Description:
This is part of a larger assembly, with 7 protein chains of 7 kinds.
Chain C: E1 4-11, E2 17-27, E3 34-44, E4 55-60, E5 70-77, H1 81-93
Chain F: H1 3-8, E1 28-35, E2 38-39, E3 49-56, E4 61-65, E5 78-83, E6 94-96
Antiparallel strand pairs in F: 1-3, 1-5, 2-3, 3-4, 5-6
Chain G: E1 3-16, E2 19-31, E3 37-44, H1 47-59, E4 62-63, E5 76-79, E6 83-89, E7 96-97, H2 101-107, E8 114-120, H3 124-135, H4 141-146
Parallel strand pairs in G: 7-8
Antiparallel strand pairs in G: 1-2, 2-3, 3-4, 5-6, 6-8
Helix pairs in contact in G: 2-3
Bound molecules: iron/sulfur cluster and magnesium ion (76 copies).
The site of iron/sulfur cluster (SF4) has 13 residues of chain A, from helix 1 and helix 2.
The structure holds 3 RNA strands.
Amino acid sequence: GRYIGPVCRLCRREGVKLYLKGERCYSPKCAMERRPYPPGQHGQKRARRPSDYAVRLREKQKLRRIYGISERQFRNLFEEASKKKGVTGSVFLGLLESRLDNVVYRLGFAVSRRQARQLVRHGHITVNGRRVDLPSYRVRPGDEIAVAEKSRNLELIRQNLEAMKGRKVGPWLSLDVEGMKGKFLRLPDREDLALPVNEQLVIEFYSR
Amino acid sequence: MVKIRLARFGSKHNPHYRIVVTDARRKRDGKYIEKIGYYDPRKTTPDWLKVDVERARYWLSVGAQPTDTARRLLRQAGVFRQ
Amino acid sequence: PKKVLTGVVVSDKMQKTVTVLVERQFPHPLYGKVIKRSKKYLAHDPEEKYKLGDVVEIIESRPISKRKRFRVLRLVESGRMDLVEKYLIRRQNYESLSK
Amino acid sequence: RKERVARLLRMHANHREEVEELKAGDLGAVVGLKETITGDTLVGEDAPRVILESIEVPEPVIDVAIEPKTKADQEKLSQALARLAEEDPTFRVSTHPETGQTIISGMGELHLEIIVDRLKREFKVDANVGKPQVAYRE
Amino acid sequence: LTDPIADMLTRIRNATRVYKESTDVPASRFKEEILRILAREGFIKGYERVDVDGKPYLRVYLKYGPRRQGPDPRPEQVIHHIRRISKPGRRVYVGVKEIPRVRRGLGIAILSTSKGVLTDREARKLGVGGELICEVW
Amino acid sequence: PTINQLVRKGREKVRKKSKVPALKGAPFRRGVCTVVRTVTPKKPNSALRKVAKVRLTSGYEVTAYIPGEGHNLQEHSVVLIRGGRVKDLPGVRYHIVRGVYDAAGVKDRKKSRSKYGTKKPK
Amino acid sequence: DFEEKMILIRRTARMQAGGRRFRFGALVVVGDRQGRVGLGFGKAPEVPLAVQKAGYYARRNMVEVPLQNGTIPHEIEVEFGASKIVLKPAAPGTGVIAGAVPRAILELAGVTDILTKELGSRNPINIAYATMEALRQLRTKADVERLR
RNA sequence: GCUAGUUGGUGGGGUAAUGGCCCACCAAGGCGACGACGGGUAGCCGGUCUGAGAGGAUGGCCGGCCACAGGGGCACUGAG
RNA sequence: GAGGAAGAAGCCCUUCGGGGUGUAAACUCCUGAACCCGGGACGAAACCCCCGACGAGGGGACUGACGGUACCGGGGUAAUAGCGCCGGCCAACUCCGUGCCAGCAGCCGCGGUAAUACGGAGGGCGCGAGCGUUACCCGGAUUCACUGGGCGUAAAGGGCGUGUAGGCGGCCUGGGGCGUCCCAUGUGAAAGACCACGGCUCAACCGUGGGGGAGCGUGGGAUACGCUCAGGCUAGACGG
RNA sequence: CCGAGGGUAGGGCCCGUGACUGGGGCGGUCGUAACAAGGUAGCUGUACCGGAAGGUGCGGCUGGA
Ligand code: SF4
Ligand SMILES: [Mg+2]
Ligand SMILES: [Mg+2]
Ligand SMILES: [Mg+2]
Ligand SMILES: [Mg+2]
Ligand SMILES: [Mg+2]
Ligand SMILES: [Mg+2]
Ligand SMILES: [Mg+2]
Ligand SMILES: [Mg+2]
Ligand SMILES: [Mg+2]
Ligand SMILES: [Mg+2]
Ligand SMILES: [Mg+2]
Ligand SMILES: [Mg+2]
Ligand SMILES: [Mg+2]
Ligand SMILES: [Mg+2]
Ligand SMILES: [Mg+2]
Ligand SMILES: [Mg+2]
Ligand SMILES: [Mg+2]
Ligand SMILES: [Mg+2]
Ligand SMILES: [Mg+2]
Ligand SMILES: [Mg+2]
Ligand SMILES: [Mg+2]
Ligand SMILES: [Mg+2]
Ligand SMILES: [Mg+2]
Ligand SMILES: [Mg+2]
Ligand SMILES: [Mg+2]
Ligand SMILES: [Mg+2]
Ligand SMILES: [Mg+2]
Ligand SMILES: [Mg+2]
Ligand SMILES: [Mg+2]
Ligand SMILES: [Mg+2]
Ligand SMILES: [Mg+2]
Ligand SMILES: [Mg+2]
Ligand SMILES: [Mg+2]
Ligand SMILES: [Mg+2]
Ligand SMILES: [Mg+2]
Ligand SMILES: [Mg+2]
Ligand SMILES: [Mg+2]
Ligand SMILES: [Mg+2]
Ligand SMILES: [Mg+2]
Ligand SMILES: [Mg+2]
Ligand SMILES: [Mg+2]
Ligand SMILES: [Mg+2]
Ligand SMILES: [Mg+2]
Ligand SMILES: [Mg+2]
Ligand SMILES: [Mg+2]
Ligand SMILES: [Mg+2]
Ligand SMILES: [Mg+2]
Ligand SMILES: [Mg+2]
Ligand SMILES: [Mg+2]
Ligand SMILES: [Mg+2]
Ligand SMILES: [Mg+2]
Ligand SMILES: [Mg+2]
Ligand SMILES: [Mg+2]
Ligand SMILES: [Mg+2]
Ligand SMILES: [Mg+2]
Ligand SMILES: [Mg+2]
Ligand SMILES: [Mg+2]
Ligand SMILES: [Mg+2]
Ligand SMILES: [Mg+2]
Ligand SMILES: [Mg+2]
Ligand SMILES: [Mg+2]
Ligand SMILES: [Mg+2]
Ligand SMILES: [Mg+2]
Ligand SMILES: [Mg+2]
Ligand SMILES: [Mg+2]
Ligand SMILES: [Mg+2]
Ligand SMILES: [Mg+2]
Ligand SMILES: [Mg+2]
Ligand SMILES: [Mg+2]
Ligand SMILES: [Mg+2]
Ligand SMILES: [Mg+2]
Ligand SMILES: [Mg+2]
Ligand SMILES: [Mg+2]
Ligand SMILES: [Mg+2]
Ligand SMILES: [Mg+2]
Ligand SMILES: [Mg+2]
């Protein structure tokens, strides 16, 4: 299953804050604020020119790592995109976004995808009033991404909810707070998002 | 002889028959002569039957004898109403 | 339908039967160029009226012996000994393809 | 490794009896097993994967060298006494450091006798036997 | 001679890369119908049915672009490329669905059919096909 | 070649040769050791490699490499083997699979244990 | 200004009495990503000099390449003496499907969506010089009609 | 280079039925470098796998046809 | 899972100042895979009996292997991680040991006292209930080249003619319509593949619908090119 | 009558193997033929000879002067 290990080292080699921890990432106690070189014995060693392939590897690993998904599940998604009509890039990221547990986090129900996954798994979320414990659910435009209202009386949903009374979830989303619902109206546009990922370099990865 | 019956398709604990006319002495799921409509016993979507009544007539007339639960689904959607 | 093909009689030396050479053309499955192939048919002449050079058509038919499953539908062109040699000169060419 | 135990026998005087179970502290016979050998523990699947106390004692007392005559059928013997060694675990095959001959070793004359006599009259073996060669020196 | 057609286009090609004002090819209706095309598509200025020692020829009036600036003055070509496709060795015949699509549009591929010596854009609109005669860009 | 020539002669499809014939198409084969000595390799190397000549159940006799440091193999060792030549060695075209049959794993092996037939150190 | 990517650095050698003397060579593509590219090959007795000299002739040798939405107007196939490069026009969703050599010279041509394939000698120099001449040969509906 | 039921014919047996399928007689034919005869290997297709494609490669499971039921030969009963 | 130090211990590295593993652990709290109780199926409505007419339509009854399982509800413990690789290709670097030994190896090659190429270690890269290897098929292989290759010197022009079969074959008009092209029609089973929707909490799996193509049979049609037949030329070829 | 097949006799094709023998691929002894005009220009088809590379005749090629 998921990567589960030490998770600062990830960004460290990745030359980029991937916001994986959630409540501590903004804190100046984060790893990347203090040591933004790669992990282990050779970080402050003067980097070597990165091969074209390194470049695409490193870059693909960046994304794959963000959504904290297996290389198996990831490629199968990416593979779906190509054959889907139109732009492999967008659609991937799209389909990559259109998966449950990353919804749950874009709607600040939980703090990181890591915390988000646990939410979905533990049944503490629901879609259309039906409980759904599967971190993979391809959420489709229209759905009613609740919280199990038997799981409404719980210290941690409250916490993260309460801290989302009027921040703005992406255009494609509608956090009806208080009642702990949400809604997924629109699979993202390319422009609709930013993450430290050149959407094309991944396509060039698997083009090998 | 020539027969109307349910040739099972689908999967394990996922029945999905496919009522059909074939030559008795086939394999159940064998080469059928002609499809005349499905049937989903567990009733998992509104359409768990759609006998092509226009047809089911033609076969009963030139020979086809049916399962004592093919009529059940055939009589259900009355190919039999006078 | 009963298949109809067309050819020259290359052998009348049979009793109530003739040999009828048939070319068909088509392109090569890989190389596209058009090729000829040909196939000699044993065809039923009940009235023994078909002779050499006799370009004729033959019709698919109910069998009359072994490998005689066509009969001649009609005389179409006659006396084409040039296609008779076009075969006999190849046929005869065989005597020098031995060892 | 894991094994199926299809049926359980019990040998009587004049008949075999089928049984459905053997309680602790009782002997009988099981059909089904395939990789099993004498000197081996055996437990139900989800149990303390313990190994029973092996056994252990006497080293062989008599030693006899065997010569594979000729010669592409030495190894008719090579696979012969590997079938043997899990059948009898008291003889001991060895090949000599110097001199390079094959040295079956045993629990006694008699023991070597039949083992040898088998090796031929049951495996054909093109071979003869006798006194081991001596590793000399200058 | 074995391929009058190839000879022709190859008279053009041969003559253009040395920038002859015109070139004469021996005559045929079928050759004209194709020449009619080159002109009508802007590959040549045009052609006429002249005469040498009383043997019907067609003069073909070639066409280029400007002189260019640099160490190579020589004008870019109007007919850049023009090769036989169907051939006496290998006949090539396309259906309408099969009809190829030259240089992503900017070139053509003349093709004999039972409705004239059209072009690829033409045949698609005239709904037929045939012996893919050559291709030009 | 002209188009007639290919109508005529065709083109010849390539026929690949096996480099492990003695496998008879198998993934691995079992054998009994007929000889276990060492051998020297060719220029520019220089060593004493540990080979075993092995009688296969396909009834081929072949000679196989033994990987690792130290082996427990000898005459009459029932062994299992795999495709894999050894470059420096004339006529070795298989390896012994370590940790199978009478093939021991390797004492004190820590990295790449799987390729040397070696269980995991507690 | 432009962007530079060295494509090929390499150390050749000449012979003279009492030993071999070297002479580093290097092949560098230069570009805008908006339509202007260039390739130059400088060789000096030291790596960087050449790497910078290659860049001098790089700018001193540029190419049009007119993009159609991040792609080429017409499939082209130029052979540069044994080396032969093939460029195909590709949809917005594809990518830069090329080598490293065509890949660089395509990326900094601001190509984003191409299909390519190196036949022949795949010598990086020669393949480079080839992908260049092929770009230089590109044309649009306009120039095509202009000439007609 | 292949061929004496070999290729054709008349007549007859046989079959649900055509036929050198089988039998008598007559003719002297039939096939072959477009590869006969012979030797090797193979159950065939829907498909499957790969490939940009053209193409290669492959036929387990599932669906269809074939073929065999320890090796052969036979016939019975029967709509079969 | 969230928090959790300018960052414990041990180990690794060091120019001996420090660097690394490392927020990783400990530690705080929050959720709660397993398990424990309680309920508990869809798959099964016909065959039959009853009114009717043994028909149409109506009504009544029996029957579940899997299964006390799926799922639903209550309670509810921090709860397996492993394999390959880290000279180049190819992503990942140091110390020690070894000293053409032991070994590695897919190819190039590496090992003869300072080995990022063997062996261990720390660290690192990649995958993750899997990771590697062996065998085989297609790919890379435009290296049997139809798409899409070649033959002066790299493998490759026959020692040279003459000619059989074969392949190919000038310019004009016409007949035929064999190739070739066009429309219609039949066939191209079901599964699969493909696009849409939907059933299992997702997916794999599975159901419904759509879209069909090649290829062949049949009918109609076109006539340029290829063919064929008929006639004419004289630029090829032959002859005086 | 045919007929499984059994037998008798003579052939043909393949596979395994064989005292001994032929060269071939891989990992010291004798000469120095080739590579510079390689110290006799080289190679060549053939022929005869010589421990060996080779030499020599005839004729050929330049990929030699
Ligand atoms: S804190 Fe969040 S952002 Fe900073 S390193 Fe750890 S994970 Fe990356
Ligand atoms: Mg609870
Ligand atoms: Mg790919
Ligand atoms: Mg034929
Ligand atoms: Mg007859
Ligand atoms: Mg008869
Ligand atoms: Mg053993
Ligand atoms: Mg050496
Ligand atoms: Mg060495
Ligand atoms: Mg042993
Ligand atoms: Mg220059
Ligand atoms: Mg070239
Ligand atoms: Mg190379
Ligand atoms: Mg321009
Ligand atoms: Mg009769
Ligand atoms: Mg017969
Ligand atoms: Mg007879
Ligand atoms: Mg006679
Ligand atoms: Mg055969
Ligand atoms: Mg056989
Ligand atoms: Mg077989
Ligand atoms: Mg390819
Ligand atoms: Mg190929
Ligand atoms: Mg099947
Ligand atoms: Mg049989
Ligand atoms: Mg049996
Ligand atoms: Mg039998
Ligand atoms: Mg500090
Ligand atoms: Mg510490
Ligand atoms: Mg420290
Ligand atoms: Mg943690
Ligand atoms: Mg609790
Ligand atoms: Mg029920
Ligand atoms: Mg009644
Ligand atoms: Mg219960
Ligand atoms: Mg189950
Ligand atoms: Mg519960
Ligand atoms: Mg814990
Ligand atoms: Mg790996
Ligand atoms: Mg890799
Ligand atoms: Mg690297
Ligand atoms: Mg030190
Ligand atoms: Mg040592
Ligand atoms: Mg290793
Ligand atoms: Mg060292
Ligand atoms: Mg050294
Ligand atoms: Mg190391
Ligand atoms: Mg290595
Ligand atoms: Mg590929
Ligand atoms: Mg391959
Ligand atoms: Mg090859
Ligand atoms: Mg070709
Ligand atoms: Mg080549
Ligand atoms: Mg030469
Ligand atoms: Mg010559
Ligand atoms: Mg000769
Ligand atoms: Mg001729
Ligand atoms: Mg002709
Ligand atoms: Mg003509
Ligand atoms: Mg027609
Ligand atoms: Mg279908
Ligand atoms: Mg659904
Ligand atoms: Mg369907
Ligand atoms: Mg005429
Ligand atoms: Mg007999
Ligand atoms: Mg016999
Ligand atoms: Mg008998
Ligand atoms: Mg012999
Ligand atoms: Mg000499
Ligand atoms: Mg000399
Ligand atoms: Mg000399
Ligand atoms: Mg010389
Ligand atoms: Mg001589
Ligand atoms: Mg002498
Ligand atoms: Mg002499
Ligand atoms: Mg001479
Ligand atoms: Mg010279």
